[PDB]
Amino acid sequence: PVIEPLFTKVTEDIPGATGPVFDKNGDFYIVAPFVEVNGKPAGEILRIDLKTGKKTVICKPEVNGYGGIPAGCQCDRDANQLFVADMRLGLLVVQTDGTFEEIAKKDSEGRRMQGCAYCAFDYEGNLWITAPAGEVAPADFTLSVDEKFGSIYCFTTDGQMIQVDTAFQAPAGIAVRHMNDGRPYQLIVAEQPTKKLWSYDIKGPAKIENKKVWGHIPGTHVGGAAGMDFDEDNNLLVANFGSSHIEVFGPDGGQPKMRIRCPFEKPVALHFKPQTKTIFVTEHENNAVWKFEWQRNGKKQYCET
């Protein structure tokens, strides 16, 4: 089955718009990773007024003269602060006043961080992170689009930054499937160009096993799975960049059980508005943000627990 809901524009003129997130007060944010100054990265985290779509710069992260490429966001639970995956700087924690901190320059083995693109909290508070880029600044920016050097990290509640896997070709969206009792059960990771969704079984903080292909992304277009989010029934909605569709997987994966046709070819990121059926989706055909109504509420995010 294929559904065609009405998409309503939220805001426009945001190059590479991604990282949609709601904070603990219901303020909406997205990131503009392609902002430059003199050919060098100067990406921005924006706050969006939901009534007018007007954009307000919250944070323009730069460290020692190297500008960031903010790319994916999650809201914290114990504090109204945003965990931001940055393709040049690693993991940031951003405050609403625009100040920010770099969380880990090196991983638990002492090795320089790779640039990060998506992240997802489990309900225990560990942050699972995809890192499709090469070494963080001051190294030259590189991207694992053709070669298998993308990595997967877990930033645990004890404050450890643990590389839990590597050798992905452009890992993208990440999400955590929880049991009904709240325990983390599977980690889902998009590997975009291979048209695969991978899963592992979560055994504990930064402990994953049983790596397997969890789902297959339709199509042969350039692109594949980008962002993803679970609904309250643990159906996984996955933006299939390049396909004009968002794929809907059942909780056990496999093939899509349904698809959502989009009025654009390039959906990227998606995020539920808490306590509603409204999905916000970003897309790079119009460099815009849209919303549409899903069949049921989103899965509760860590920040709402």
Numbering used by the authors: 4 to 308
The paper states:
Following evaluation of ∼5700 clones, the variant CEnT1.4 emerged, containing seven mutations (CEnT1.0 A21T Y37F I146L L148V Q149D K225V S271V). CEnT1.4 achieves a 4.6‐fold higher conversion of 1 to 1a compared with CEnT1.0 following 60 min of irradiation and shows excellent regio‐ and stereocontrol (62:1 1a:1b, 99% e.e.). Structural analysis of CEnT1.4, coupled with molecular dynamic simulations, reveals a well‐sculpted active site pocket that pre‐organises the substrate for regio‐ and enantioselective catalysis. The BpA244 photosensitizer sits with the carbonyl group directed away from the bulk solvent, as in structures of EnT1.3. Molecular docking of the product (+)‐1a and the substrate 1 into the crystal structure of CEnT1.4 reveals binding geometries similar to those observed with (‐)‐1a‐bound EnT1.3, with 1 and (+)‐1a in close proximity to the BpA photosensitizer and forming hydrogen bonding interactions with Q195 and Y121. The CEnT1.4–1 simulations show a major population (∼90%) of the substrate pre‐organized for selective catalysis in a well‐sculpted active site pocket formed by hydrophobic residue F37, L146, V148, V225, V271 and BpA244. The substrate also forms a hydrogen bond with Q195, has a C H – π interaction (edge‐to‐face π stacking) with BpA244 but does not form hydrogen bonding contacts with Y121. In agreement with the simulations, a Q195A mutation leads to a substantial reduction in activity and reaction selectivity, consistent with hydrogen bonding between this residue and the substrate being important for selective photocatalysis.
